[PDB]
Design an enzyme around this catalytic site. Structure first.
Site, PDB file in Angstrom:
ATOM      1  N   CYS A  82       0.811  -1.185   0.000  1.00  0.00           N
ATOM      2  CA  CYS A  82       0.000   0.000   0.000  1.00  0.00           C
ATOM      3  C   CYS A  82       0.861   1.258   0.000  1.00  0.00           C
ATOM      4  CB  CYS A  82      -0.854  -0.004   1.270  1.00  0.00           C
ATOM      5  SG  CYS A  82      -2.184   0.998   1.106  1.00  0.00           S
TER       6      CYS A  82
ATOM      7  N   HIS B  60      -9.325  -4.212  -2.020  1.00  0.00           N
ATOM      8  CA  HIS B  60      -8.306  -3.419  -1.325  1.00  0.00           C
ATOM      9  C   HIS B  60      -8.788  -1.985  -1.196  1.00  0.00           C
ATOM     10  CE1 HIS B  60      -3.859  -2.619  -0.422  1.00  0.00           C
ATOM     11  NE2 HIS B  60      -4.338  -1.414  -0.574  1.00  0.00           N
ATOM     12  N   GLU B  61      -9.215  -1.441  -2.303  1.00  0.00           N
ATOM     13  CA  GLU B  61      -9.533  -0.015  -2.427  1.00  0.00           C
ATOM     14  C   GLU B  61     -10.871   0.294  -1.745  1.00  0.00           C
ATOM     15  OE1 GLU B  61      -7.146   1.843  -3.070  1.00  0.00           O
ATOM     16  OE2 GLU B  61      -5.997   0.253  -3.973  1.00  0.00           O
TER      17      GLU B  61
ATOM     18  N   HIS C  66     -10.396   0.657   2.013  1.00  0.00           N
ATOM     19  CA  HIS C  66     -10.007   2.034   2.386  1.00  0.00           C
ATOM     20  C   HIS C  66     -11.172   2.901   2.705  1.00  0.00           C
ATOM     21  CE1 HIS C  66      -5.757   2.174   2.193  1.00  0.00           C
ATOM     22  NE2 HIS C  66      -5.713   1.730   0.948  1.00  0.00           N
TER      23      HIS C  66
HETATM   24 FE   LIG Z   1      -3.717   0.831  -0.459  1.00  0.00          FE
END
Ligand SMILES: [Fe+3]
Length: 200
Positions: free
Chosen positions: A127, A170-171, A174
């Protein structure tokens, strides 16, 4: 002005100083939904994120701008707590006729369906916001269906597998205050539960 009024200035190119790092409270906050039809800030914010991912993947702009290479980026990493992500995934070589596997900004994205089967990248994950080494299999769903709106505020649905499913997860994480290392088993980071598919 705000991180958003700053990043959306026509002169502004996103670089590493705009990316906040592990420890900053905004990475652990639940991002805010964007409202529709999209305001132009939210629209430009997305084009800037995709341009950053281009820049970071081009050898010449990356080294010169001092960028660390990426294939996804989420507004919370820019200290903008909104549900906006960009993914920019190149097609594999063996140099492709079509540059990108997936190229998309997603607004209010969310997993509405996923496979029972889990998957993880064999090489673990990294990341832009994490400036340390964290070894281990980051356990995700093998397949996902995402609901999201595009830059046209159009409702989209998209089924993903393998590598792009991992990225999108993953995104989206966030936007929910979740960092990849949260999904690593601390006890044994390279444990394989039965069923786990590794993406080599
Ligand atoms: Fe990331």
């Amino acid at each position: 002005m705000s991180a958003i009024k700053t990043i959306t200035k026509a002169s502004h190119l996103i670089d590493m100083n705009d990316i906040i790092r592990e420890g900053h409270p905004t990475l652990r906050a639940v991002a805010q939904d964007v409202t529709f039809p999209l305001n132009e800030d939210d629209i430009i914010l997305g084009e800037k994120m995709l341009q950053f991912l281009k820049n970071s993947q081009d050898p010449v702009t990356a080294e010169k701008m001092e960028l660390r290479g990426g294939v996804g980026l989420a507004a919370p990493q820019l200290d903008i707590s909104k549900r906006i992500i960009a993914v920019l995934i190149p097609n594999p070589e063996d140099p492709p006729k079509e540059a990108y596997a997936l190229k998309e900004v997603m607004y209010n994205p969310r997993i509405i369906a996923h496979s029972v089967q889990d998957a993880a990248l064999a090489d673990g994950e990294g990341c832009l916001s994490v400036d340390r080494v964290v070894e281990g299999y980051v356990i995700r769903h093998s397949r996902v269906t995402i609901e999201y709106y595009d830059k046209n505020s159009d409702k989209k649905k998209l089924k993903l597998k393998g590598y792009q499913s991992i990225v999108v997860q993953h995104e989206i994480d966030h936007t929910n205050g979740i960092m990849f290392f949260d999904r690593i088993n601390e006890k044994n980071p390279f444990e394989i539960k039965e069923g786990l598919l590794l993406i080599e």
